[PDB]
Every structure is written in structure tokens, then in C-alpha cells.
Amino acid sequence: EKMQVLQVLDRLRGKLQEKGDTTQNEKLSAFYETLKSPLFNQILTLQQSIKQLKGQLSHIPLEVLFQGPVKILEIEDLFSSLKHIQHTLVDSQSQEDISLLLQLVQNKDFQNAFKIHNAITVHMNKASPPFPLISNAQDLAQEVQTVLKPVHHKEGQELTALLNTPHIQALLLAHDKVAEQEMGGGLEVLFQGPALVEPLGLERDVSRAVELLERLQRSGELPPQKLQALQRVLQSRFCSAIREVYEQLYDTLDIT
């Protein structure tokens, strides 16, 4: 028979179906896949078997020999889901099963193997690197503003204010600098002075600008071309990668 923990995840996902929740089933499945993956298993066995193994192991290209999953889950979300489920399934077996899973996630070797696994997999689970949809997003944003200025549209006023914020300005600058690819960098401008904002604030403003651009094209009271273009730049894989990487960088900031 397969590992008890895998059988446990099977039962739990089924019981959540019967309970009619299933909001946690996809995370439980990403957990199963990590538990099952050849890469994670080898890492765990190493962690458990050889205590002298010290420091970071994620710089070792274990993936050359061992397949891993495409989806990564953060340990805190995983803990979070297990706890939610613990409040959700009140039956004897489920309570016992969830206890088992919570114990496993608490285990120090499990936690290190998980961190190493995710640090390797984040490099191996990506599709093709994105390319910028334009080279001058800052110029495009200014052209959108000029188009909007005469309109007196209130959503237009909101949009030009958003496009004028330090962090949106920094996003567009970062976009154009990274697009140069021989400009060396670009991401650092998102961390300078007033440009620095919580990734959620950044995301909310980018999402809002996109919403306003859409509404403004729906109005039919100005030429749509540049609005559509800026919308697609903001939604582009390239711009999305810049924002994803920003969030990850922000998360590692150490304020002493």
C-alpha cells in the first residue's frame, strides 16, 4: 500500500466533497503532488538520513535526476488550509487524519525539505520567458494621458492620477529598463523612495487602471487604440513577471 499520508489526502478530499466545501481541495492536491514528487522524496530522505547536511541545498541541481511538480505551495498556505479543514470536518477519522497531516507539516525535517524543494522547483516549473509587448511603456502612458486630458471624464481623471503615482511610474520605468536587456537591471527602481509600496497596493492600482481603461474603451467617447495598448501592456506576461518578482523581492526585505 502507498504512504498513509497519501491515502489520508484521498479520504480528506472525498470527505470535503460530501461536506460540500472543496474550497481547499486544489491545495490538498498540490500537497499530494509535492509529497509524491521524486524530487521532494529524495530531498526528504537526504534531510532525514544525513544530519551533517548543512546550510542551503537548493543550489544543488537535483532536478537533473529527479522530476518535480509544476505547482508550488507556500508552507503557510498549507498550514492555513489544514487548519481550516480541521474546523470543517468534525468526524472522528477526519480529525485523526488532519492531526496526522498537521504533525507532518510541523516536523522540522519536513519543513526544510519542503523549502529546498520549492527553491529548486521555482526555477524548473516555468514556461517560455516573456518578451515585452512594447519598448516604451512610459511614453505610451504619457500618450494615454494626453488623449484623456481634454475629455473631462471622471474615470479619466482617476486614471491619469493613477498613472502619475510614484509606484505606477516606477513600474513603467522598470518595464522599459528591463526591456532593454542590456540596461543591466530595472527592478531596483521599484524600491527607491516613494516608489516603494506594498505589493498588494501595487496590484490593486494596476488592476484599477486596467478596469478604468476598459470602461473608457466601452464609453466610445475617445479613440480606443492607445487605451487598449496600455491595458495589454499592464496585463502582459512581461509586466506580470515584473510584478511577481517585485512581490517576491519585497517579501525578502529585511528591515534589520
Are residues 2 and 120 located together in one domain of the fold? yes
Are residues 101 and 132 located together in one domain of the fold? no
Are residues 65 and 171 located together in one domain of the fold? no
For residue 253, the tally of other CB atoms under 10 A from its CB is 8
Are residues 1 and 29 located together in one domain of the fold? yes
Are residues 75 and 98 located together in one domain of the fold? yes
> Could you give the CA distance from residue 28 to residue 9 in angstroms, rounded to a whole number?
7
- Where is the domain boundary, 94, 126, 158? 126
Are residues 139 and 217 located together in one domain of the fold? yes
Query: What range defines the domain where residue 44 resides?
Result: 1-126
Are residues 192 and 247 located together in one domain of the fold? yes
CA distances from 67 to 40, 204, 207 (A): 9, 36, 35
Are residues 255 and 131 located together in one domain of the fold? yes
Are residues 81 and 27 located together in one domain of the fold? yes
The tally of CA atoms less than 13 A away on the side-chain side of residue 77 is: 12
Find all residues with CB under 8 Å of 102, minimum gap 6, and list them. Answer: 79, 82, 83, 86
One-letter amino acid of 100: L
- Where is the domain boundary, 79, 102, 126? 126
> Could you give the CA distance from residue 105 to residue 87 in angstroms, rounded to a whole number?
17
- Where is the domain boundary, 104, 126, 148? 126
> Could you give the CA distance from residue 58 to residue 112 in angstroms, rounded to a whole number?
11
As for how many domains the chain has, the answer is 2
41-45 long-range contacts (CB < 8 A, ≥24 apart) are 41/66, 42/66, 43/113, 43/116, 43/117, 44/109, 44/110, 44/113
User: What DSSP state is assigned to residue 151?
Assistant: T
> Could you give the CA distance from residue 216 to residue 159 in angstroms, rounded to a whole number?
10
Q: Is 182 helix (H, G, I), strand (E, B) or coil?
A: coil
> Could you give the CA distance from residue 76 to residue 97 in angstroms, rounded to a whole number?
19
Are residues 132 and 252 located together in one domain of the fold? yes
> Could you give the CA distance from residue 22 to residue 161 in angstroms, rounded to a whole number?
41
By what technique were these coordinates determined? X-ray
Residue pair 48/137 in contact by the 8 Å Cβ criterion: no
One-letter amino acid of 22: T
**Polymer length of the chain:** 256
Which cell is 110 given? Answer: 519536513
CA distances from 129 to 3, 132, 148 (A): 37, 10, 33
> Could you give the CA distance from residue 49 to residue 43 in angstroms, rounded to a whole number?
10
> Could you give the CA distance from residue 73 to residue 68 in angstroms, rounded to a whole number?
13
Are residues 105 and 214 located together in one domain of the fold? no
Which cell is 13 given? Answer: 478530499
CA distances from 243 to 2, 31, 131, 167, 191 (A): 40, 26, 14, 11, 12
> Could you give the CA distance from residue 9 to residue 2 in angstroms, rounded to a whole number?
12
Q: Which residue is associated with the grid cell 496585463? A: 235
For residue 67, the tally of other CB atoms under 10 A from its CB is 9
CA distances from 74 to 12, 123, 130, 167, 194 (A): 20, 15, 24, 27, 29
Q: Which residue is associated with the grid cell 524600491? A: 191
Q: Which residue is associated with the grid cell 520605468? A: 173
> Could you give the CA distance from residue 78 to residue 189 in angstroms, rounded to a whole number?
33
One-letter amino acid of 72: I
> Could you give the CA distance from residue 63 to residue 70 in angstroms, rounded to a whole number?
12
